[PDB]
Amino acid sequence: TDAPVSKASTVTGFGRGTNDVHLSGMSRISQAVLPAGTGTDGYVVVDATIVPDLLPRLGHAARIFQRYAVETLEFEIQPMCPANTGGGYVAGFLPDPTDNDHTFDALQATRGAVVAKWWESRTVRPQYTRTLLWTSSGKEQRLTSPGRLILLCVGNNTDVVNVSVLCRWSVRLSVPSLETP
């Protein structure tokens, strides 16, 4: 071969990363300790917006991706109080992150909402958006979070209640990037 003025660049494998990871797992999105007698009807025990940052192991994975799509979402309310406590709880998943209404009727309207006594556990199988949602935050949060889990006291509680909200997320990240805080 001859000697050129400047040789051509030989970078072949650039910008060819993997664009599909089906990360999944289970994590605790909220832990609450209700003092006795403060579980008044309508009190908001848990108000958690489902974002990749909220889920611990999903936050780092979404930091290196642009868009994620929730493939399977399920919640499991697991109170740890004894069986001699009186009162009820309601758990639901509002599919609109901007909604700020916190009433029993609002949760009861949504599909998959559960009402139970504090000495009994329930699973909230919700209705979420299957579309692609951006990992990073923005002006409108409806493109970033599938919804918000809300857990209220239906009735006045007698003893101290230690509730724990668990989430079984299953996402499919795509559009590789190196998103930064």
Per rule CB under 8 A, is residue 46 in the interface with a second copy?
no
Known binder of ligand: residue 2? Answer: no
Q: Which of 50, 113, 149, 152 binds a second copy (CB under 8 A)?
A: 113
Instruction: Select the span of 13-21, 36-44, 98-106, 153-161 touching Ca ion (CB under 5 A).
Output: 98-106
Per rule CB under 8 A, is residue 43 in the interface with a second copy?
no
Shortest distance, position 97 Cβ to a second copy, whole Å:
9
**What is the dihedral sign for C-alpha 118, 76, 26, 18?**
negative
Q: Is 35 exposed, middle or buried (CB count within 10 Å of its CB: 0-12, 13-18, 19+)? A: exposed
Q: Return the bridge partners of 170, or none.
A: 24, 72
Residues 6 or more apart in contact with residue 161 via CB below 8 angstroms: 32, 33, 34, 39, 79, 81, 85, 87, 118
Per rule CB under 5 A, is residue 136 in the interface with Ca ion?
yes
Per rule CB under 8 A, is residue 10 in the interface with a second copy?
yes
Residues 152-181 that bind a second copy (CB under 8 A): 154-156, 158-162, 164, 166, 168, 175-180
Q: Which two tokens stand for residue 55?
A: 């889920």
Q: Which of 48, 53, 69, 121 binds a second copy (CB under 8 A)?
A: 121
